Structure 1
Amino acid sequence: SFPQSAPHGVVFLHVTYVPAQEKNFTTAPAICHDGKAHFPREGVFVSNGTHWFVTQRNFYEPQIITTDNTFVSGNCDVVIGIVNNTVYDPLQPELDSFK
């Protein structure tokens, strides 16, 4: 904000952030992989119809689901509405390249 002077008061100029151009997708509370439920560290899981990604809450920026940005807590038999997608781990390609 920026202040301005008035003859008998004060004038405030407030700069704010307003989102626009919304779009809707399909979401799931968690991902079940190898019998383990994965939850996002930040953001939510969204899908465009064929693949699942991770985006921010207030901005759309799809990312490949990875162990780096997800954490595991228990099995996937308790969470209601879980889906059955897979996750990615770059350590396996890193190990494969060391041959």
Structure 2
Amino acid sequence: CHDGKAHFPREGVFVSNGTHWFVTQRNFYEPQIITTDNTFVSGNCDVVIGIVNNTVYDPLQPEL
């Protein structure tokens, strides 16, 4: 969940190491930061069951 929107992975799954959330491919553990370039948005944060709160990184803002 981010800013009231539901973000889903383009590929792979979301996993937590106990303190931080990452997105990784299913057949081999190789975690990366969750960003707008590896997720897609569909529906709001209220429609998905089991949805959790986090921040999704936007790679374009640091240069603006």
TM-score bin, normalised by smaller chain: over 0.9
How far did 1:94 drift? Answer: 1.4
SS of the residue 2:40 aligns to: strand
Structure 2, unaligned runs of 5 or more = none
Higher helix share: 1
Q: Whole-Å Cα distance in 1 between the matches of residues 9 and 59 of structure 2?
A: 17
Shift, 1:34, TM fit: 0.3
TM-score when normalising by structure 1: 0.64
Paired residue secondary structure (2:32): coil
CA-atom RMSD in angstroms: 0.5
Looking at CA atoms only, which structure, 1 or 2, has the larger radius of gyration? 1
Which 4+ residue blocks in structure 1 deviate beyond 3 angstroms?
A: none
TM-score calculated relative to the size of structure 2: 0.97
% identical aligned pairs: 100
Say how many residue pairs are matched: 64
Alpha-carbon separation, structure 2, partners of 1:85 and 1:73: 16
Report the CA distance between 1:76 and its aligned residue: 1.0
Secondary structure, counterpart of 1:93 in structure 2:
helix
